[PDB]
Symmetry: C5
Subunit: 268 residues, 5 copies
């Protein structure tokens, strides 16, 4: 919300344009409104499409996280329905699945998963997971071992193993999705072009408006400025949905909901 600084700067640019309107003819500078409508409308169209792309990206982040909840739910359900007896296996997989949620969060947030992982897994596993450059992936592999061992123990057939393997695939896609979102930002050129253009437009605007609106200039100018900046900053906040900002995803809340959901499903 550094926007209020930019709004103040606009009012200052407006009064400058008022006081210096007297010297217009003298300096030989003529500025009509029509060419600034053309520019403004274009910027609005471009901002419109840009804002759209940003929203889609935010939506995708939400979906991928939604999939974690879904896929981890059904995997646990599958475990209970196929092997209701093997509570030993349940606890191990549920922990791994809960670890995955937290590991992914920390990975995306660029924070330290050590505390959460130690809260969930034995140390032999925790140090092994943190040993991998890709810890979240390492958790999936370990979760895969449990299903694999259950198959080798003959407790799962190839079919029932396959039924569960699909859920690990689903989470692999989530990990992939999130990494792609995190590592690949919306092209820097989008923020580079638009911010330059919008800021300079808002700044130059009163100098074209002053000829027409005179004193009313500051009000009409700041209002158009507000509109364009608000739209522009919304797209900025949507672009990176894994940031810690107030407009972003409450990942902690989701990870807690996932953890509570799985522990609820095992009677813990």
């Amino acid at each position: 919300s550094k926007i209020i600084f930019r709004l103040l700067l606009n009012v200052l640019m407006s009064i400058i344009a008022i006081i210096s309107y007297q010297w217009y003819e003298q300096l030989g500078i003529h500025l009509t409104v029509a060419p600034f409508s053309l520019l403004g409308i274009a910027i609005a169209i471009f901002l419109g499409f840009r804002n759209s792309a940003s929203y889609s990206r935010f939506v995708e982040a939400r979906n991928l996280w939604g999939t974690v909840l879904i896929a981890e739910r059904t995997l646990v359900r599958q475990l209970r329905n196929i092997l209701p007896a093997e509570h030993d296996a349940h606890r191990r997989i549920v922990s791994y699945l809960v670890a995955f949620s937290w590991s992914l969060k920390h990975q995306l947030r660029k924070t330290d998963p050590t505390a959460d992982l130690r809260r969930l897994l034995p140390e032999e596993r925790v140090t092994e997971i943190l040993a991998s450059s890709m810890p979240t992936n390492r958790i999936l592999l370990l979760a895969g071992n449990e299903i694999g061992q259950l198959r080798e123990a003959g407790k799962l057939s190839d079919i029932t193993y396959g039924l569960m393997d699909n859920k690990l695939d689903e989470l692999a896609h989530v990990l992939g999705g999130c990494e792609r979102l995190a590592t690949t930002p919306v092209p820097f050129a989008y923020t580079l072009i638009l911010q330059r253009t919008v800021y300079l437009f808002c700044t130059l605007l009163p100098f074209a408006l002053v000829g027409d609106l005179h004193y009313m200039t500051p009000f009409v100018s700041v209002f158009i400025s507000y509109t364009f900046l608000s739209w522009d900053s919304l797209a900025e906040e949507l672009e990176d949905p894994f940031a810690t900002a107030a407009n972003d995803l409450p990942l902690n809340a989701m990870c807690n909901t996932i953890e509570r959901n799985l522990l609820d499903m095992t009677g813990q």
Copy 2:
């Protein structure tokens, strides 16, 4: 329609603009249409996009609900097709699937599912369901136990169990999808910014219009005001598709349809 108030208030502002037009040069105020055209078209573009995004949420909401009927239909079908004899299993599973629907509706409406659950299931189950933090997910698990037990008893093979398991996974996707839409709407910036913007534009508009239209100012002002507000409030409505507004989903109607479908003729089949 809370638009009518703002539409009426717009006519009041339009009278103010007519009577105060003479005094423009005295008060040192000049207002042309051109700047408001620029601002208006920009607001229209942004409203245009916003509304589209809202309709999307509505459409996805509707699709998620359509999947319930589809996946529930086929699961029953599969049961009727693979185990045509097991009517006791049929009835138990159906009642769960029906419970899932009503439970989901209550969840998204944040209302009490107790009445509907008792109507459908034994009390030992109603307490088990209301015990859970997520009752709808609990219902899925119970539905799952039924399919699971038919496999323990060797009535279902791994293959046919899987075929039916797939359908529960489908419902789980519906559950998660709906939660996504419900628990977190669009950003809160979207609503508070645009609503203020659209109305501040609407109130200032006559003051800029009066120069051109004079008396016809209130007419053309309320027209534009309507067009902009109509779109914003509709967008606002469709953003929460699980709410109780006019343009939202008839979830009650939908849950009936699901129920009637699953109990086709008291759950009978040749």
Copy 3:
């Protein structure tokens, strides 16, 4: 075309604009182009977004019917490749799949399917289907019984059953999709808001145009009006793609195509040496 009444009314609205142009400022009423440019554009943006939604809905409808053909083709093909000898089963399943198509058509068209169902199926089955509150879904169940009986008999394994079952799932999605599109229209509020704004904008336009064009008003006002009315009525035809309008789906032809297709894949009287 009930659009042509609105164009005539536009001509008449232009004419009164021309003649009553005198008693304008004498009262004090003024109408310029720039404010109607803003409104017009706002309306054009809103129409554009709505039409987009309507087209999507039309595409989806076309897509869903597209799937019926794909799924029934493959289900018949699967029966041919897995159980090549069982032509009794073929004809039974084929007929149900044809029945499904016609039943679904009648359901969306809100017409009686008894004729078609009797043409295709024995009377016990027509009774069975019409007894259901959801007849088309009942046909799928019956189709599923055929596959299920072949599994009971051990002619199909659980795998081969599964392969065929998943095709019924496709048809189940089609049925659900179509029903959804039939009962969930583009929210009425859209069609309501746009219908009011477009009509009001078209009638007031020649009054806001007369100042600038004087006599040329009727010729310009109509051209603008027609544009907004054409684009609006395009959406109103695409939102209801199951009726018997000019823009709607030829569901009868498509049903024939499906009946033709399945009787092309079968129909080869087998065992003639």
Copy 4:
């Protein structure tokens, strides 16, 4: 372009507008920019959305054809991986898969597939396929029989049969997708209505521009017309991606790509 006729008719309309503007006052017929500006922007928005839909259809066609390549590749891969010894089967299936591609291309183009089928299949099959009203569908069924026979011989299990059968479903989905996409006039005359709206706008525009640009009318008026006519005709092209009035290069290229690919995969190499 072939739209250079309407660009010339524009310049001719400009010259009419210049010379005749003198006799405008002696009636009281005027044309400002403001109304035609509104009309133009409105049309542009509509053209914008229409074009978007067209491009969408074009992309979907490219996807469906891309799937033929993918599915036909993986089916052949599966055959080599699961039944490496069964080359006679490899050959027959590959024949049908290549047949499917060409037969689909011909179907959508409404052109004669005889030559292409004759190069790939015995005249017995070619007659059978062309006897059917749905020849591409027939080829899929024939390819299916081949996979089915390997199963009945016990060479494929129900699982491995399933795996390959899935690929034939993909091709079936593609055939249907293409059939829908080729034979779907989503608007009846609304593609012509908007086209005529662009036509009239472009021919009335100089009469509205003359007051402001005078002689520079033809210069600006043709440029505006060019933009509108180009965008309209582009949407018209993308609308019908399988049209005889479209580009055949990509469709023929793909059929050759798939053929080259499938022969490479079975080591047969080029077919004469």
Copy 5:
């Protein structure tokens, strides 16, 4: 490379100023209004186009994502299902890594021989370079490894099926990338817009001069920048497999894939 036209705009604006005094002398009028109409039209058309170009970029980024995902899970499956078959692990992983690099080369239209020799025995490198599509060949070879394990009875049809599905997924990636390479948005699009945006940008000062006088160049360059920025950004996103500044870092992505697959096989980069 745009700053050449940004300059040419200022020059054309100067021409517009110095030749404004000859305007009525020649009898040429240019108002802003008709250029607003044309400007907005182009802005709408650029707006949609840029949107389309983005989709291609996102799809390409998505397809490459699947490579990481599909290969990760394929290795995971090998480890979970055949934990003792480390010969198979290494061979398959080498093919998966080969596929990644070969795809990078395929799309960039470069020579894969360097990378192939680093990863595979020489007989295979020949077999691969012999094929019309080398990447497709690598998948077939990866498929042979799974197929061999099946005949040996180490994999059931079901477990073979599970692994096969991942090769199918990569085939889809191959097809997808191939489609985004070989088929750009047709010739028409760029030939229309690029010329149109240019001609508009250079003719705009002539129309702006009346209203703006000297301020012409400043306003005209501002509009021109906006229109050209958007136009060129769209062009960069259109071809996502190029080596341009705002394009997929395919070298970096292939490293990530290789590192991930090494990590999973208990090896070190």
